[PDB]
């Protein structure tokens, strides 16, 4: 089915315009539209007009209209129609709650037969990060559930207050939440956006380049959401690919794809819930392939209760890409998240025992009132996602004592 | 027809002696040549200079009621008769 | 059939110059009334290696003479001849014998009343040159003075002079001072009377679909209602059948039209299922529509070459659920496949949706409420209290139209 992308904030625009590059120059569409000289589908992810136009389905959101400007100015075939110009935010989002709404159903009423909607934000962002919360309520709403959301949320390097509450709404409305840090990410280089829009990419490779599996973002994801309260993934990358010295086999791509360096997210000793690895090459070896998952499977530590499978899928390269070497990515379900969330709740606490910014959001009786229970929700969920995670370690997790 | 006939004849009685004094490769050759050559011409008349193509159009057009307006104005016009 | 076109007040004229030339643009027929060659049409194949002849309908609207030389149906009726001066410099092609040249309604009225013979005069030259006449086309406004008054005892004159035998039109376009709520009214009261069909077009929305000139918009809407009678095809052809497919009883004559804005720029709709279904949205209808409106008919035109039959039936079966249809009335949905004019260049498709909704009670319950605000020899008093009982006789019909 196709899916819809939504772009909120500076970080997000940016991150959308490094990811729909990447995509376009992976189908051969050119900046204008315009086709170059079919087996893959990029009919899931842009629009396919009757004078052979390729347009993007993505809708462009930002308080601000320099960071627009300069998306589409870099890209001309998006659609102008589609654009549209941290309490503060989300009480503006509540006045244009209509035209959003509206602006929704038009590529909902575009596409023939939707499948998921991707978010591209970032939780830092403060007045975006607002916009953007009110975007997973109101697509939720309206929606209901039949159509679940992936949102590649950009995690922080008065910050801590945004973080919960955008991390609220994260948690009751996502399907399925990446988690990226900036931390990570910069350490691996040793710009940014261009590892998270290729992680982002290749997610999907196996939808746009039909293989014998996997044809489906339900199949992808269902085999790393055992349950709902456990939505967040870390995303692990290998670096080392289209210098000399490579990986020699797949094989060891599989090998040193759980590398805890090369994760995109801070980490100590963690268990995984579940694994799937990317491989995209123009040729693999299944007995390399087989050796390499018997070995991570002997490996790697699961958790108890988990059928401890690791799936491989056998992406295909694209055909605009001359015959470059193979290249891989591992998407995996980690307990590791009680650390950054543990994190983000000591740093919160810290900053609300002092008073330091309130007076920003704490209007009068009845505002101060209001966002000390928004707060204390928010805390209490945070709270209750920790103890879930931390619950999924110990081995009496389906014991009724 | 007549051209047809000529060329045709210049091949039978002049270059061999006859269907008869013919191998089966050849008349078979013959023969083939003279079926493209002959359907090449009658799509040239029927569907050239006939425009069989444009008078299945007026048919569709006059028959199936495509041209609605000049049945209104028959019908309007012949109310009484 | 043949339709007369009459133009009254400042800003009929300015609509209809612009309609007329879009007119003239389709059929190809120059400014000077030089007819040009009809090309070859694209639907007729022939075979291939590897002048007066037409397939239209253009003389329903223009006269040809015996030169080859088309000119419009069209009478100018207004005092002030600086806008008709300007018509007639754009479009020479305008007989200038057509031409009739002269704030309170009741001076105008009276006016109209003084002069009704001269006028009477030119409307019988025009009909003398149609045989078998079908309707006529009037563009006015009802609010703006001249065109209040005149268009006013010209639609009385039309209509008792013929003996109401022909239907009669109207693309009144609504006001956007202490005189235009009266001007208002008293027009609505006749536009009840006599109108057969009323085309209702609300300034304030025309701004708001433009700004994502105004007359361009009211132009475009109402040269392509008559896009089957210009290019005949299956169904309709006839101005009589159009209308008779939207107005299921002599008061509920009121219709509006939706536009689709985006013929032009290069992100225009992919196809013709998209724009069925962007076609009901409520932010391009050219009257202000709430969400509690229900659609007592529908009719959407599409204007292109070799329409998708698979695209367009599905559009239809999936608008037919989104749409509220009164109670009464059966749920249908018909689409006009019209046929692009071969003279444009243009390959995109156009769209036009004229329906027959509710929404019609809270804009004349504004124009009632102002109307009454305002009012706080006697003869014109009592026709201001006929007019007031003659609106809320179609405020109240309109709103028992909900119930079974």
Redesign the interface.
């Given at each position: 089915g196709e899916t819809i992308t939504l772009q909120v904030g500076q970080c997000g625009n940016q991150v959308g315009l490094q990811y729909w590059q990447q995509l376009a120059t992976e189908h051969g569409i050119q900046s204008d539209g315009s086709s170059t000289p079919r087996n893959d589908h990029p009919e899931l992810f842009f629009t396919l007009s009757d004078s052979n136009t390729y347009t993007p389905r993505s809708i462009l959101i930002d308080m601000e209209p320099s960071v627009i400007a300069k998306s589409t100015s870099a890209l001309p075939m998006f659609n102008p129609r589609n654009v549209h110009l941290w309490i503060n935010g989300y009480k503006y989002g509540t006045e244009e709650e209509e035209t959003l709404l509206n602006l929704i159903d038009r590529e909902v009423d575009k596409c023939d037969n939707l499948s998921n909607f991707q978010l591209f934000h970032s939780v830092a962002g403060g007045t975006g990060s607002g916009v953007g919360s009110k975007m997973l309520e109101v697509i939720s709403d309206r929606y209901g559930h039949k159509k679940l959301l992936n949102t590649f949320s950009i995690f922080p390097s008065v910050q801590p207050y945004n973080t919960i509450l955008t991390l609220k709404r994260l948690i009751d409305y996502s399907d399925a939440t990446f988690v990226f840090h900036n931390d990570s990410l910069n350490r691996i280089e040793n710009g940014a956006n261009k590892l998270i829009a290729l992680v982002s990419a290749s997610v999907s490779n196996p939808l746009r380049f039909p293989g014998y599996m996997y044809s489906s973002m339900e199949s992808i994801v269902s085999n790393l959401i055992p349950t709902p309260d456990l939505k967040f993934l870390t995303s692990s990358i290998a670096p080392f690919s289209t210098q000399k010295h490579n990986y020699l086999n797949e094989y060891d791509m599989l090998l040193e794809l759980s590398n805890d360096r090369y994760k995109t997210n801070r980490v100590g000793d963690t268990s995984y819930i579940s694994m799937l690895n990317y491989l995209i090459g123009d040729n693999l070896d299944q007995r390399e392939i087989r050796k390499g998952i018997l070995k991570s499977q002997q490996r790697i530590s699961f958790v108890p209760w988990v059928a401890r499978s690791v799936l491989v899928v056998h992406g295909k390269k694209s055909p605009y890409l001359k015959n470059t070497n193979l290249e891989g990515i591992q998407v995996t379900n980690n307990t590791s998240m009680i650390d950054v969330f543990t994190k983000i709740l000591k740093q919160f606490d810290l900053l609300i025992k002092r008073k330091a910014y309130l007076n920003r959001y704490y209007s009068s009786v009845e505002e101060e009132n209001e966002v000390m229970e928004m707060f204390n929700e928010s805390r209490e969920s945070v709270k209750s996602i920790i103890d879930e995670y931390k619950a999924c370690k110990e081995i009496t997790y389906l014991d009724d004592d | 027809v007549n051209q047809y006939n000529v060329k045709y004849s210049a091949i039978l009685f002049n270059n061999h002696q006859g269907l008869a004094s013919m191998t089966t490769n050849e008349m078979i050759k013959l023969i083939d040549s003279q079926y493209n050559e002959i359907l090449t011409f009658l799509?040239?008349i029927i569907?050239?200079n006939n425009?069989l193509?444009?008078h299945v159009?007026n048919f569709k057009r006059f028959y199936f009621?495509?041209?609605?307006?000049?049945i209104?104005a028959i019908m309007?016009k012949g109310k009484d008769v």
């Amino acid at each position: 089915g196709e899916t819809i992308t939504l772009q909120v904030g500076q970080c997000g625009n940016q991150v959308g315009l490094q990811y729909w590059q990447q995509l376009a120059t992976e189908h051969g569409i050119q900046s204008d539209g315009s086709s170059t000289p079919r087996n893959d589908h990029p009919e899931l992810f842009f629009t396919l007009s009757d004078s052979n136009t390729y347009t993007p389905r993505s809708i462009l959101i930002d308080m601000e209209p320099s960071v627009i400007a300069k998306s589409t100015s870099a890209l001309p075939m998006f659609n102008p129609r589609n654009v549209h110009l941290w309490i503060n935010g989300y009480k503006y989002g509540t006045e244009e709650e209509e035209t959003l709404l509206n602006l929704i159903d038009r590529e909902v009423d575009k596409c023939d037969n939707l499948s998921n909607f991707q978010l591209f934000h970032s939780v830092a962002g403060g007045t975006g990060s607002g916009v953007g919360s009110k975007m997973l309520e109101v697509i939720s709403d309206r929606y209901g559930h039949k159509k679940l959301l992936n949102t590649f949320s950009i995690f922080p390097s008065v910050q801590p207050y945004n973080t919960i509450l955008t991390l609220k709404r994260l948690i009751d409305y996502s399907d399925a939440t990446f988690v990226f840090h900036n931390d990570s990410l910069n350490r691996i280089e040793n710009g940014a956006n261009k590892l998270i829009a290729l992680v982002s990419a290749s997610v999907s490779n196996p939808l746009r380049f039909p293989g014998y599996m996997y044809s489906s973002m339900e199949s992808i994801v269902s085999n790393l959401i055992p349950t709902p309260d456990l939505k967040f993934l870390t995303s692990s990358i290998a670096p080392f690919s289209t210098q000399k010295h490579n990986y020699l086999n797949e094989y060891d791509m599989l090998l040193e794809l759980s590398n805890d360096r090369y994760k995109t997210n801070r980490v100590g000793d963690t268990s995984y819930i579940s694994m799937l690895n990317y491989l995209i090459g123009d040729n693999l070896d299944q007995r390399e392939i087989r050796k390499g998952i018997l070995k991570s499977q002997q490996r790697i530590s699961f958790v108890p209760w988990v059928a401890r499978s690791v799936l491989v899928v056998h992406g295909k390269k694209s055909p605009y890409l001359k015959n470059t070497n193979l290249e891989g990515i591992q998407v995996t379900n980690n307990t590791s998240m009680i650390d950054v969330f543990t994190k983000i709740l000591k740093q919160f606490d810290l900053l609300i025992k002092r008073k330091a910014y309130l007076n920003r959001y704490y209007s009068s009786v009845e505002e101060e009132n209001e966002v000390m229970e928004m707060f204390n929700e928010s805390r209490e969920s945070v709270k209750s996602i920790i103890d879930e995670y931390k619950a999924c370690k110990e081995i009496t997790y389906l014991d009724d004592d | 027809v007549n051209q047809y006939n000529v060329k045709y004849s210049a091949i039978l009685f002049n270059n061999h002696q006859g269907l008869a004094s013919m191998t089966t490769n050849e008349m078979i050759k013959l023969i083939d040549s003279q079926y493209n050559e002959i359907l090449t011409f009658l799509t040239q008349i029927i569907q050239g200079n006939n425009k069989l193509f444009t008078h299945v159009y007026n048919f569709k057009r006059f028959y199936f009621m495509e041209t609605n307006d000049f049945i209104d104005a028959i019908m309007v016009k012949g109310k009484d008769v």
